[PDB]
Amino acid sequence: DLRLHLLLNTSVTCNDGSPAGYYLKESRGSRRWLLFLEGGWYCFNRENCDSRYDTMRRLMSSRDWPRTRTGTGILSSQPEENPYWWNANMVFIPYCSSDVWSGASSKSEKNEYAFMGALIIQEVVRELLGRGLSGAKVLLLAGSSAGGTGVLLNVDRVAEQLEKLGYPAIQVRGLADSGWFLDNKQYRHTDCVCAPTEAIRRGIRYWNGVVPERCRRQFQEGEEWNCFFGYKVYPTLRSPVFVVQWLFDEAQLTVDNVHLPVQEGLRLYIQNLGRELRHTLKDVPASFAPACLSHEIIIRSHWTDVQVKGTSLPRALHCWDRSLHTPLKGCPVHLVDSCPWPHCNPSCPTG
Numbered sequence: 001d002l003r004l005h006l007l008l009n010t011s012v013t014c015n016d017g018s019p020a021g022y023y024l025k026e027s028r029g030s031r032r033w034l035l036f037l038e039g040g041w042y043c044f045n046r047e048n049c050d051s052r053y054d055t056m057r058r059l060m061s062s063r064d065w066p067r068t069r070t071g072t073g074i075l076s077s078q079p080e081e082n083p084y085w086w087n088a089n090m091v092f093i094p095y096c097s098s099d100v101w102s103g104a105s106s107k108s109e110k111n112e113y114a115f116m117g118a119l120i121i122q123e124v125v126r127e128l129l130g131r132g133l134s135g136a137k138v139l140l141l142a143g144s145s146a147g148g149t150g151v152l153l154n155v156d157r158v159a160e161q162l163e164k165l166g167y168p169a170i171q172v173r174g175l176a177d178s179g180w181f182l183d184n185k186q187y188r189h190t191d192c193v194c195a196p197t198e199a200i201r202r203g204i205r206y207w208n209g210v211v212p213e214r215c216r217r218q219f220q221e222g223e224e225w226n227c228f229f230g231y232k233v234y235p236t237l238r239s240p241v242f243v244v245q246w247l248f249d250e251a252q253l254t255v256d257n258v259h260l261p262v263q264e265g266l267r268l269y270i271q272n273l274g275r276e277l278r279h280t281l282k283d284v285p286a287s288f289a290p291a292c293l294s295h296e297i298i299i300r301s302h303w304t305d306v307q308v309k310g311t312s313l314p315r316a317l318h319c320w321d322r323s324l325h326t327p328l329k330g331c332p333v334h335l336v337d338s339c340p341w342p343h344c345n346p347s348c349p350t351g
């Protein structure tokens, strides 16, 4: 299991000012480090953050965190559950900043909550260097849902941080699971109070959110919300990033106001969503995108079960590792389903 360490720099906090932290399981012989960002939506004003504090407090505070957590999926230490990186050093970073890992603002006389996601990542990396990360060969920053978007927003900053700290030999890579969203038209209506473009636009100002520098320079002031959308931020990144995304992601459908006898309009909407997602992945060389209606994969215990074109995700990730040492015979890394309806892939999760 992974053991809790609260940050020694107690100025790097969860939303309510309690210290942020990480869960760690070291692997003495290993020079591989997996840092996983938890997900769980976000909040973007006083009223909706107050409601989140009432009923989702673990995502806003470390006060009730347990001393340990069990690693599952890519965080499992058993080769049977995790064929990919079972022997790596494992870190689970709880999501307690409600800011898609983008914030750099403290709780103060003017701020009821602290939004410190981007600083939590930097501080975890800094404190791990003294616990063995200084000897790393590869640091894989992974994450699911809001944590997957967090990978896209932070992977290059982790790389820059390690370079400036004097560790240019650590290879920083990203694994973004279920964080690749489309700013598409909703199937029906709008209400918010959501259209994620508007909520993210407000969140960035509420959180003092930060985005990767090259993306920020493209979109400029007032338009940094664009960098929260994978297909727009990905081309600006320098670190290798493997993208995992269900073609019919449940969170995407939720923000699109789709709630599942499907008639023609909704059928065409769903098929076009899968086609648009597939189009955005065409030039992403390392990707795994099954035609399923689901959400998240990499920390699920049965993550080894789904396959695209006969290749599982742990295999694709291993092939990615080999590619980062010309395509490899029978070891693909670009795996995007082409069939057009959820569960047209027989290996999709059953629910």
Ligand SMILES: *[C@@H]1O[C@H](CO)[C@@H](O)[C@H](O)[C@H]1NC(C)=O
Pocket (backbone or CB within 6 Å): 009, 011, 012, 119, 123
């Ligand atoms: C603690 O974190 C804050 C915010 O990231 C930073 O400004 C400060 O230098 C840090 N101090 C130490 C001792 O790590």
